[PDB]
């Protein structure tokens, strides 16, 4: 239904059509109250408007070369390049750039925009035979995602379970089959960390292994659920947009006020999923293989790496400008700290380069980005983000903490007269501009919005051990570790306890002095 | 007169009397509006109530052994132990314990409480001759601060200057003498980072060297200013107390709601400072020597190290309880991360031990804490705090980011029915307890309050290079580096290019094979 | 009989008597050859002479105040302070200073000197009743170690086992009882990392649990073995002393040439252990409890922390002297790096202060150092050492790598004429002094000796996880974690989902705006 909000079948949503598609009576709660309409609600309206700008850019002629491709469906339409299966290394590079162009529209701050799950559509389109009996749903869903620009999110993290409850009760926490019917399946359960689901059309409800499920294929499900389906509910976390709106201003919280992606709990209360929305049904094997063989996990980290690099573009220059304000950019050591930030920004662009240039042919003509680069991004990003934030905080030693409370302070001459005198920029800018730049930096790192972004980046791919284990596993599974080991084994083979085994090196029996010494 | 709110002259304020002394028409601005009364204002009332609890504790029979001493003034009254000059190492240990018992009343979160500037009073009482003409002011201010428990703060950080403006304009930014009169001195200027000054009685206005002052003794001042003096004004930063009250709850922000210390700009607009409040007057020599020779900088770091250790007590156990919630404390690697947190917590307690055990006699019977330990605390605290915060964030991989917005969600059964089943604690606690614990942890690290505390801890003592230089200077100025070097010089003297110069070691001419080889 | 080389029973060995006591036909191998006499052998002679200097210091009149105490045995003699049981905190402080004065004699580089296992003697003396049937052996060995200064080492680390071998054959790797006889017990097995055991009188052979022992009390042993007992053999690692002697000089390797402590494999081939040397016999319970209850592990980390702090004294001043040579000490950033090394140096001294000041009474009047400080030292030392070495390496950007090969280059005028011109010190010292200083720095960090010292310091106490787990366990077992948790529980008790539960704070029902906003 959401796609019927388009006035045309040969392009994705416009911003206006996307916003109207959200006025569907989805069930959302925040601060104990039900949200009437996310496009007008104080907690979501600007964040939704920010996403709508992404859809608008798709139809601006000066954007289309970098953003858009013809569809591969025969419709004659166009779409964002990352929504269509890449068939070469050059195609992936064009997708990498289209992702970048969309990230710039939120300065890298919105991470779960529609291009993230576009890789899921491409995975369905490239490898639909994975789903066996549900292959045709996969084919149909790729076309619909590609042509419409449908906004998906991924709901996969299981809720916590009380390890003291009887196992028979603890399992009613996970997504599970309740009833198999001719119209589809009725399911119940919950997922956590449904980031920006309040603004999506559909969520993919994905399998997460839990040891308490044991056997029981009723937990081994993967399906699509529309956000307006009866029994789908979101319980929202606190809204940095609404708090910034209620007690601040755009000047005081310039990022919180427009880029907040609410991390919800998604509840499924006896929801009917039609069969055409089912992708994996009572199949532990396919569920367990999906991460490696489905394609999605091998594609979306291109988007996540690019989005981060665009954010690091922003953070780098925002730091430089902030240090011009305080005047500490004159110092050699301060310049060096900024230089390391530059180096981290460079790193993730270079990884995304390598993802594309080393892309490999897969099934049905599709190309996958370099897999080792995907794992390397996942490992490095939490380290770099923590280091950059530390570099920022130790280099604005004082400018951030005493900033006047409010744009209201500037608009009250009784107060502004003193601000204009005592809080000018060191480089000749006035107090208004200095306070503006530093409040922007604070909203990036120290506001509750900034705190959440740090926590999100650090834990994006899992625990610190898990992402390093996954990097090791890719090296072993691809044969890289064996090739590295062949080099070590060759070295070991060139000598033994009696000397060299290869002819070009000199044994030391003519110069060894141990007999003489002992 | 502020102490005249006391019903007795033989004890410091009670909580009630402290609050009443704050209803004095001090001029404070926040969110473009003037504050009528900090004890009732939504941005300050709970923080003020939290400080008042400190004054209440001084008179509780169960608290008095650890908190209070007789005064040394002949009044026969008692006071907080850190308000009276320590006359032995055991006295410093009793003061460290008195500081600790007071920090626990804010769980380590309020750093700029009345005991911080109590060391300033003790410096004045211990070394009054430093001030020459103003020695009697120093003596009297010691008596007054000690007997009454007056709440001082320290305002020293100069405001920023626009380096493009004519030097004639840059100097009316700094504290400076306007006019000398018989009733006192008239001063103008500003200071930044006036942490919790809105809740104090007096601010001590301290000299900060700026290269633009050059000569001109009109900048070389140190004096005391009351908060309600005509022309004294505070410009407040955003209030985390008020925002948590307006859009949250104590359940949702248990630390922001009661422990926020607003970091203000302090403005002096042609303020009359009476002579009895002047400590250094048109004296660059005394101003530049005061940090090293006055005593205060050699005393207050004991309070800061202890307060940090109490917060680390709290953070350590709160992390443990958070990992009990999520169930990841079962993992060996998670337990190891917690153990490192324990190690950092132990470190700062151990530093405070060394401060007292290695204390040195100073002037007039007063004792100073170990100077090297103070410098070491300053260097380690930014590293430890940043490291601990990272350990916390990477170990609550998911529990923090999707927490329901509001206690209102728990109090709406339509919503609470789902929270009760999907967000239980892993260790058998219910969803209310789990969400509460994790919201307390988030307010510690990720809320705007948590973000500010991180930035405060990192920059407390200056830039990262500056605190390390201060540590180096103390080792050199104290003779420590010379003693270390004497060992290196001894080692170097025991051999030369011909062999050993000491009799007990064997030269290698009987075993050296180089002639043989070459 | 080893003590019978003393000309007096009222003092420990002199250096000369210690060296003579080592000429006993102990069976030691290195470079495939048997060692005739460790006191003359090119791999051990200077290291033995360096230990002999410790014994000589015990009898120099100017050293005796800091090094020596009367014995507590009634003999009327004296001993090194750490060899006699401490009965107060002040005694522990005197011991720490006595340890320091001995470590300064190798500039902190010999770690396994006789004072290390002196804590083992004191443990036997303080808690001899632990050993039941062997209580009198414990008493006698305390008396003997204390009065004579006998040199013990600790051999505890089990050798590796091949997990593919039959469990019956895997068991012959560990120390185990072979036969009980009338004169004592016959044992076989091995231990690894027997650091400097080649220069000791006795080794204490300690129980290390291996899962393959299972039951079988034949493994549950603790006993003392003399180094010259038939069947005791050491298999040595490479000798940095001998390599420095054969291809270097004291000028070229001033630390390798005299302070190398060879980390041997200790082999027991059917060794007869007399009953008077047995401490724990076929007793798993006592073996498992010994680490916690024996006392030794609660004592020797004082010695280890002090030795490290003395080494860090040396490294700190050696780095400063190196940066004067290179001229980079002029830079602000270099001075700051040096300042951080200073801070780490201060930290371990401060930890040793806290060990003594917070000492606790134990059994039979003995005092134990503060336990949390011991665990904190163990955790911080590997971090501090790796950081300090990296700091050193990044600050001598070129001076270390091209240093001329040999003192022979200086003594060849054909070569020295260029060195005198091209390798002077930046601070006016000649090339001989500059090259000498930088080679001393290289031997500390980059020589094979320096490389081993980095590996030893990093792994001294076990794996990085294990030492953090021990720190956590101490916090929990001591009640510290419960005391920290009581603070978190108090904070949690002061509010619920309906507001504050205490009267002094203001509820926000009067300022909450959510009803108005939603």
Numbering used by the authors:
A (entry chain B), B (entry chain D), C (entry chain A): 2 to 519
Copied sentences from the primary study:
As an FAD-dependent hydroxylase, 4-hydroxyphenylacetate 3-hydroxylase (HpaB) is able to ortho-hydroxylate phenylpropanoids in a molecular chaperon-independent manner and has broad substrate specificity and high catalytic activity. Among them, the HpaBC complex from E. coli (EcHpaBC) has outstanding activities and a broad substrate spectrum. More interestingly, we found that EcHpaB is also capable of hydroxylating a series of phenylpropanoids to generate a wide range of natural products. The highest titers were reported at 62.7 mg/L and 34.7 mg/L in whole-cell catalysis studies, respectively. These results indicate that EcHpaB has a broad substrate spectrum for the hydroxylation of a variety of phenolic compounds.
In this study, we solved the crystal structure of EcHpaB apoenzyme for the first time by X-ray crystallography. EcHpaB is an (α2)2 tetramer, the model consists of residues 2–519 for each of the four-polypeptide chains in the crystallographic asymmetric unit. The N-terminal (MHHHHHHHK) purification tags (residues −7 to 0), Met 1 and the Lys 520 for each chain were not observed in the electron density maps and were excluded from the final model. The tetramer can best be described as dimer of homodimers with chains A and B forming one dimer and chains C and D forming the other. The overall EcHpaB structure contains 30 helices and 16 β strands, which make up five β sheets. Interestingly, the low-homology sequences of EcHpaB and TtHpaB enzymes results in highly similar three-domain architecture and 3-dimensional structure. Structural alignment of EcHpaB and TtHpaB revealed a distinct sequence and structural difference in the loop connecting strands β32 and β33 and covering the entrance of the catalytic site, which consists of eleven amino acids. However, based on the secondary structure prediction, the EcHpaB β32-β33 loop appears to be segmented into three sections, two random coils were separated by a Type IV β-turn. In contrast, the corresponding loop in TtHpaB is a simple random coil. In all cases the crude modeling suggested that the EcHpaB active site could accommodate these substrates in part owing to the plasticity of the β32-β33 loop and the observation that main chain hydrogen bonding to loop residues played a key role in positioning the substrate in the active site.
